[PDB]
Design a protein around this ligand. Structure first.
Ligand SMILES: NC(=O)C1=CN([C@@H]2O[C@H](COP(=O)(O)OP(=O)(O)OC[C@H]3O[C@@H](n4cnc5c(N)ncnc54)[C@H](OP(=O)(O)O)[C@@H]3O)[C@@H](O)[C@H]2O)C=CC1
Ligand SMILES: NC(=O)C1=CN([C@@H]2O[C@H](COP(=O)(O)OP(=O)(O)OC[C@H]3O[C@@H](n4cnc5c(N)ncnc54)[C@H](OP(=O)(O)O)[C@@H]3O)[C@@H](O)[C@H]2O)C=CC1
Ligand SMILES: NC(=O)C1=CN([C@@H]2O[C@H](COP(=O)(O)OP(=O)(O)OC[C@H]3O[C@@H](n4cnc5c(N)ncnc54)[C@H](OP(=O)(O)O)[C@@H]3O)[C@@H](O)[C@H]2O)C=CC1
Ligand SMILES: NC(=O)C1=CN([C@@H]2O[C@H](COP(=O)(O)OP(=O)(O)OC[C@H]3O[C@@H](n4cnc5c(N)ncnc54)[C@H](OP(=O)(O)O)[C@@H]3O)[C@@H](O)[C@H]2O)C=CC1
Ligand SMILES: O=C1OCc2c(Cl)c(Cl)c(Cl)c(Cl)c21
Ligand SMILES: O=C1OCc2c(Cl)c(Cl)c(Cl)c(Cl)c21
Lengths: 254, 254, 273, 273
């Protein structure tokens, strides 16, 4: 039990030769996770449901940076798509080392106005979808693999009105991480959740206020702020971090 | 702002003349919530989905203790039932002061073995169902009302293997409570979650180990242990408690 | 099977504090005074501890007696462990037993971390943290089997946007961990240990430092402060009062709180700080 | 728009600590020594603080130099605020600047709450809590704009089943609140403040009190202890090592940790305590 796990020094942060799959990587945070993982030496499978041109654009940009990439279409709201996606994925690069479950949708509304269709739309993607991406990831990941789920500051936020559906769909992910860390540990896979505060993306648009209001550091959160933490968790540096929820919001209070 | 909210002294704990609706009150924890609320002076609407004979038995026992009660059949997995249930409910006693969302199902399985049907079965009742019972409760509750949702120690537990689905369905409730407390506060309704540890019920069966293992107090948790906290929250004593998660597990660590 | 035994009475009596003896530290003023009054109103005999406010302490004692319950004041400085030990010995000799201990005494403190002196850090922690721990140590020793220990925390223990409050906040955050750990130890006597964590509450502490939680509120009128506390710290749109806290303390102090141990109950009207 | 500016380098360089100067308290042994070594391995110049282990401190300093990075030891007792101030002044005069401060020094303590003495409580809090706060105060003052402050917590800050550990656990729990509050204050210099909360880690502290976290483990062999720690505290089935902690500290210390502030990162292999 004294045996050092992995390399001492900077190489422990290396993602060289790893293969990562990121869901919803054609745009926003998912796109930057893919770009950054690629820059650190990973071959990346860029999943998308709709944004096809965007997806091929991410794949091309990743190749331009020196790493192989490919895209796979799949809607996480359909478990059959998720199963197919992983089967396709492992055949592209031969194995899967890292899985970043990032696909998600936003929603707003006073609880009184929430319809079952809106609730179902959000939970099927943000919660159910991530659960099943996690199930398939467990099956296909290399022993010693990595699974990073997507949460949000709203999972624990205390002052966000008209956001019960969205927040609740994200809060659930935090418990999944704790519970899946136990189950998936039998293949030495760590399972963690990244919980971004506000981050500039299309979802975000739906700067000075965000800068001064949600951060003492006085700036806006960017996709790269999240991508960097994902790479840490995905590396050997994140080896003793499992079942945790990492808040990435610049010291926000919401 | 110096005006005292409600009566000073013991009367602040009184539930005399209140009308409460409890979901899944024909058995287990829900049955005891109904009995105890009744003993404290509440008229109780006993909801059930299947246990009809059990439901009428709870209603009869509550009457025998000195309070009026009635039962209403409704499956929380069907939002149409929930809407109907509340419409029926308010017509029985004329108003609704307290709503205890308690209906829930248990589930077990290593993440790898979870099917979409099992995941959906559990989330539709434990999460989606409670959300919609909450939505209708908001609509029908008296200004100054009370909404108590049902959680679990598993929402935050760290060592329960093969329980991602169940735990996650409960963890979501904790975020709902925080978010609904904001929305529902416009009618002065407090929203909280009770999170029981192991409690002796039918679900439980699925004593010395539970006694010594999950509690320094060295005994098993009972439905009344939960019912009592529910009554506190439901009373004027719980007036400044909103958006909170109250753990009721005798000091357990799971 | 023997575990099927119902702990305590079924029904409203489970919330009764009749014939209970409680001790409240810092009960001459603020939240502590109201805890004492409310506990007295629900049937408890109360030992009203105070360190300085003698006249106020006797006023609370007289008021509690007027409401129909016995009371007595005991002077003790929580920053001196010898005083606490002496206080508990005097307490059990006044009423014979101790069923409930409410550790409430505390001081507030403001200042950017860069400006904190070892003397200021020491002053706050000696009362808020060290003091509560030894009041707890003694409460464990003297409490009845099946007793109750309620510690005083604060929303600041978990708050994320309170600047210039590291010392005070940290002194209350420590209490949350004490509750979890002491709940284990004290359970060998069936004592439950919990923390009440209030948000802003109208008391002398409130008035003094209230403006220090409000961005550019140093020039706020008292009404603009109350109004700011009402709308800003609570969806319920009102200010927190000592009675809001006293009521939860009584719940925890009663048989209703029997399965509640090692917990932190936030009492802030749904505040985000 | 100006907020679209990317903070730091894109790619692997963002994890680089090249040309950084770090100070680690209690770096002569245990987790602190490894933090120093690993920081040194990633390109940092390190000030190895120690209070007693002089020979060990110079050994760490020599080892760091052998790995190709400069280092120097500074003696200071964290329980004495004057020592900490002097330590920071000496530190910035050795390497010219300070980019990273790792507050690691700490002592362990065991005992049922009833048996805790004011001297034992004071000994632990003066080093674990008071000491870390003043190392933090000074780190704020001397750190570069955009610096890093990593405080040492523990799984015990939130643990729910550790008996006879209220003093130690409480001293670490306070650190979690300090991080949230200091992150606000220290942000005016763009400094991020976080806490690393390890589970059981093989060091001298580990060996001594390990058996005190294991029910009836007082008669366990060293192997049965390691084996118990392996299976009992981690689904990953292995014991935690100083390097497991050092790696996370380096992440936080780098540009990768730029948006991570006011957080507590648990590093326990998924333990439940
Ligand atoms: N940006 C923010 O402020 C925060 C975001 N988050 C979470 O981070 C994640 C990324 O957010 P962000 O990048 O801002 O989002 P955007 O709205 O910019 O796009 C997010 C991604 O979700 C994908 N997606 C949606 N539905 C599906 C689906 N059914 N199957 C597969 N992929 C799908 C989209 O792909 P496609 O184009 O193919 O539809 C898109 O790639 C989300 O889960 C979000 O909830 C959390 C906190 C804050
Ligand atoms: N007992 C324990 O250890 C713990 C329980 N809990 C939660 O507390 C609640 C009560 O648990 P417990 O009493 O032990 O459970 P039981 O299994 O004894 O029965 C729970 C209740 O759920 C009701 N129910 C199930 N489905 C529905 C539905 N579709 N619509 C309406 N009611 C429904 C059942 O009614 P019916 O007969 O009509 O089907 C029953 O009344 C649950 O939500 C549970 O998850 C949380 C932590 C611990
Ligand atoms: N007001 C608020 O908004 C909040 C208050 N709290 C906590 O609640 C507790 C009481 O607060 P509050 O009533 O507002 O405070 P006040 O400022 O009104 O004073 C409260 C009590 O503290 C007592 N006290 C101070 N020092 C000592 C000491 N050395 N030994 C014994 N008793 C002492 C005082 O005694 P004496 O009469 O001798 O002066 C007084 O009885 C504190 O622990 C506080 O930090 C937590 C969150 C919010
Ligand atoms: N090991 C574990 O399982 C865990 C450890 N921790 C925390 O990590 C930190 C280090 O732990 P670990 O390496 O195991 O501990 P060790 O017992 O191995 O000793 C660690 C360091 O603490 C230093 N120290 C003690 N007192 C002082 C003082 N008064 N002033 C300055 N430095 C002092 C020691 O200095 P010196 O050489 O002079 O003796 C030593 O360098 C502590 O804060 C500890 O509580 C947290 C969780 C788990
Ligand atoms: O936690 C607290 O301790 C004292 C206090 C005051 Cl006096 C006020 Cl006004 C507010 Cl808002 C808060 Cl949150 C606190
Ligand atoms: O939190 C801790 O501080 C020291 C320590 C040791 Cl020395 C051991 Cl062995 C274990 Cl298991 C834990 Cl959790 C801790």
């Amino acid at each position: 039990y004294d045996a050092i796990p992995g390399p001492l020094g900077p190489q422990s942060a290396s993602l060289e030769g790893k293969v990562a799959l990121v869901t919803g990587a054609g745009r926003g945070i998912g796109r930057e996770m893919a770009m950054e993982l690629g820059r650190r030496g990973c071959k990346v499978i860029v999943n998308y449901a709709n944004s096809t041109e965007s997806a091929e654009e991410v794949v091309a940009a990743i190749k331009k940076n020196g790493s192989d990439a490919a895209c796979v279409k799949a809607n996480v709201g359909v478990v059959e798509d998720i199963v197919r996606m992983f089967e396709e994925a492992v055949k592209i690069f031969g194995k899967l080392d890292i899985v970043c479950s990032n696909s998600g949708v936003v929603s707003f509304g006073h609880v009184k106005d929430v319809t079952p269709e809106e609730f179902d739309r959000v939970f099927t993607i943000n919660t159910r979808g991530q659960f099943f991406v996690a199930r398939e990831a467990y099956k296909h990941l290399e022993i010693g693999g990595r699974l990073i789920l997507m949460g949000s500051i709203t999972g624990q936020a205390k002052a966000v009105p008209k956001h019960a559906v969205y927040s609740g769909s994200k809060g659930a992910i935090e418990t999944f991480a704790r519970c899946m860390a136990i189950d998936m540990a039998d293949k030495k896979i760590t399972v963690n959740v990244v919980a971004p505060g506000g981050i500039k993306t299309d979802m975000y648009h739906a700067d000075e206020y965000a800068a001064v209001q949600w951060s003492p550091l006085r700036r806006v959160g960017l996709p790269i702020d999240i991508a960097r933490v994902v790479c840490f968790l995905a590396s050997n540096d994140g080896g003793w971090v499992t079942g945790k929820v990492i808040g990435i919001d610049g010291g926000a209070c919401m």
